Amino acid sequence: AYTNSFTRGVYYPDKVFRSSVLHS
Amino acid sequence: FQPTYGVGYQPYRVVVLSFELLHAPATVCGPKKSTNLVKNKCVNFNFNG
């Protein structure tokens, strides 16, 4: 069977703290 | 490997040290003596290198 992931499966890319920012 | 062989055919031991020199928290360090922590002054600092 199948289902839609929506916006699941994002993770922190590196062990650095960042705040109030948009990071590509 | 034989003791008589030419040097390019003799055995060498190799150790390769891979460093995870990352932004992650440390557990292997050089023998640097830590100081007390100064606050609210302009200072030089060195946190884990």
Curated annotation (Swiss-Prot), chain B:
Residues 23-45 are annotated as: Disordered. Changing residue 9 to H: In strain: Omicron/BA.1, Omicron/BA.2, Omicron/BA.2.12.1, Omicron/BA.2.75, Omicron/BA.4, Omicron/BA.5, Omicron/BQ.1.1, Omicron/XBB.1.5, Omicron/EG.5.1. It comes from the Viruses. Attaches the virion to the cell membrane by interacting with host receptor, initiating the infection. The major receptor is host ACE2. When S2/S2' has been cleaved, binding to the receptor triggers direct fusion at the cell membrane. When S2/S2' has not been cleaved, binding to the receptor results in internalization of the virus by endocytosis using host TFRC and GRM2 and leading to fusion of the virion membrane with the host endosomal membrane. Alternatively, may use NRP1/NRP2 and integrin as entry receptors. Binds to host ACE2. RBD also interacts with the N-linked glycan on 'Asn-90' of ACE2. Cleavage of S generates a polybasic C-terminal sequence on S1 that binds to host Neuropilin-1 (NRP1) and Neuropilin-2 (NRP2) receptors. Interacts with host integrin alpha-5/beta-1 (ITGA5:ITGB1) and with ACE2 in complex with integrin alpha-5/beta-1 (ITGA5:ITGB1). May interact via cytoplasmic c-terminus with M protein. May interact (via N-terminus) with host bilirubin and biliverdin, thereby preventing antibody binding to the SARS-CoV-2 spike NTD via an allosteric mechanism. This is Spike protein S1. It comes from Severe acute respiratory syndrome coronavirus 2. The gene is S.
